[PDB]
Structure 1
Amino acid sequence: MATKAVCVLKGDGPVQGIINFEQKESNGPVKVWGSIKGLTEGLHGFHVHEFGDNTAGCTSAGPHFNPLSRKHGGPKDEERHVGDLGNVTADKDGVADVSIEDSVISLSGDHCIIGRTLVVHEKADDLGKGGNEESTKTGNAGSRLACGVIGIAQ
């Protein structure tokens, strides 16, 4: 069983980075950390999307990974997609030093994210609190700036 995974994020613009995933126990939380650069200062939606398909760029990754067919939420919510990792924050130099721990994604089993796509978005994820239909689907986080397939790591 995989205990480590990695994702190289690339897109059409300047946004790029490397995100690592580590999971001590298949029961336990996944630590997610790494650095993304080229971003506008502030919050960006950060999600695992369902398909590891980059054939038409980030668009072919499909919607948020949601095998329990829930509504969109933030990572602390009981009602959330498996792929709802919330936001990451870029500093004034355009750098997000990502550091998240999450107990809903996994590197094995039904919630396994290996082979799916990590995407960093154009705008803040509103965490399902925007009071419109789109908030309960995508969090209003806008365009996909960069993405990559999550792969098994050594």
Structure 2
Amino acid sequence: ATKAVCVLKGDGPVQGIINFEQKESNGPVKVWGSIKGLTEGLHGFVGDLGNVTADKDGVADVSIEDSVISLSGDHCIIGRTLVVHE
């Protein structure tokens, strides 16, 4: 099979198969999400209240996430500031 990702025979759910091949990427990558799996029965081969949680909160005014910023020059300031000339 030489190179082969996610090779299988039979049954059973398969979820979340990711193949990344980068050549001089120079960038941000974000993989995220929640997975839930269950197998029952399986004869001849009780309910649980639950929840998976991956949220977020928080209040701001300047928020940068998974971004690329480039500000080259003079007086490159991030956030509040005060510049007075003469």
| TM-score computed with the length of structure 1 as normaliser | 0.13
Unaligned runs of 5+ in 2: none
Structure with more of its chain in strand, by fraction = 2
Return the alpha-carbon distance in structure 2 between the equivalents of residues 105 and 43 of structure 1. 53
Partner of 1:28: helix, strand, or coil?
coil
RMSD, aligned CA = 21.2
Runs of 4+, deviation exceeding 4 Å: 2-16, 19-25, 39-46, 83-121
Q: Distance in 2 between matches of 1:120 and 1:22?
A: 49
- Residue deviations 1:76-129, cap 9 Å, x none? xxxxxxx999999469999999999879999999999999999999xxxxxxxx
Q: Which structure has more helix as a fraction of its residues?
A: 1
Answer with 1 or 2: which has the greater Rg: 2
How many corresponding residue pairs? 85
CA deviation profile, 1:42-93 (whole Å, cap 9, x unmatched): 99999xxxxxxxxxxxxxxxxxxxxxxxxxxxxxxxxxxxx99999946999
Distance 1:37 1:17, change over 3 A: farther
In the alignment, the residues of structure 2 paired with residue 120 and residue 39 of structure 1 have an alpha-carbon distance, to the nearest angstrom, of 64
Q: Report how far residue 32 of structure 1 moved.
A: 1.4
CA 1:85 to 1:38, structure 2 compared with 1: closer, same or farther past 3 Å?
Answer: closer
The Cα of 1:26 is off from its aligned counterpart by: 1.4
Any conservation in 1 of the 2:6–2:17 contact (CA below 8 Å)? yes
The 3 A distance-change label for structure 1 pair 39 and 12 is: same
Tell me what 1:10 maps to.
9
Unaligned runs of 5+ in 1: 47-82, 122-153
**Mean Cα deviation higher: 28-37 or 93-102:** 93-102
